[PDB]
């Protein structure tokens, strides 16, 4: 369905709400309140997922671990690897270049 | 030790992994790469949840929105309100007071 004014209005509000979170967390990092903020805003399993996703991204970029090793060690099965690979390919070049510098 | 070795070894790995994420995002903000990093690391529905949780926290601290309005505007039923309230109570007071300054003007 082509976006309607109702759906566009809701999407823009969600976008602004997201940016407000992003800026709140930016500020928290500047005031050394990011750790308690992240504990408030994210559940323990969500925090764990983020930690694991960094490893999945790292290992996809490194290219050394096999699919079976990614599944065993990171819990990342074939569909998770496909999605993570897609996210990497869709990322802007500046992000991919930086991730290569910092994670490898 | 608080935990047996198996559990402790898993917790230590998860802790390291969490700090790696925290540091990665810290540096992404400094490099203006936070938006694409968070798009990579979080699904659209997870990003939406975070945006909505900020509003729930804000409205809990503000005290003006009713229970019905929290549900109808922010999707937060009775149990969600209780959880969010509990998280706020457990947070350091320094964080709660900062959130009041920065979310409530
Ligand atoms: O697709 C998912 O299940 C969640 C997800 C979000 N960002 C990711 C990066 C790498 C691997 C998985 C994810
Ligand atoms: O408990 C939840 O459903 C998720 C959650 C994490 N932090 C929150 C802050 C306010 C409202 C909900 C949450």
- State the Cα angle at A10 between A27 and B48, rounded to 5°: 45
- Residue B18 and residue A53: Cβ atoms within 8 Å? no
Q: State which ligand 1 atom lies nearest to the alpha carbon of A60.
A: 10
- Which of A24, A42, A43, A48 most suits a substitution to test ligand 2, by most atoms within 8 Å of the C-beta? A43
Is there a contact between B57 and A40 (Cβ–Cβ < 8 Å)?
A: yes
Structural domain tally of chain A?
1
Q: What is the resolution of this structure in A?
A: 1.1
Structure-solving method: X-ray
Lookup: tokens for A40:
């408030």
Domain extent, residue A15, equals 1-104
Long-range contacts formed by B89-95: CB under 8 A, 24+ apart:
B91/A36, B91/A39, B91/A40, B92/A36, B94/A33, B94/A36, B95/A33, B95/A36, B95/A37, B95/A40
CATH code of the domain in which B83 resides: 1.10.1270.10
């Amino acid at each position: 369905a082509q976006q309607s004014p109702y759906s566009a209005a809701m999407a823009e509000q969600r976008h602004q709400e997201w940016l407000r979170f992003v800026d709140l967390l930016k500020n928290a990092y500047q005031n050394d309140l990011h750790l308690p903020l992240l504990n408030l805003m994210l559940l323990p399993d969500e925090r764990e997922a983020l930690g694991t996703r960094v490893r999945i991204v790292e290992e996809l970029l490194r290219g050394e671990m096999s699919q079976r090793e990614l599944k065993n060690e990171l819990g990342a099965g074939i569909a998770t690897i496909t999605r993570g690979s897609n996210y990497l390919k869709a990322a802007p070049v500046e992000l991919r270049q930086w991730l290569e510098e910092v994670l490898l």
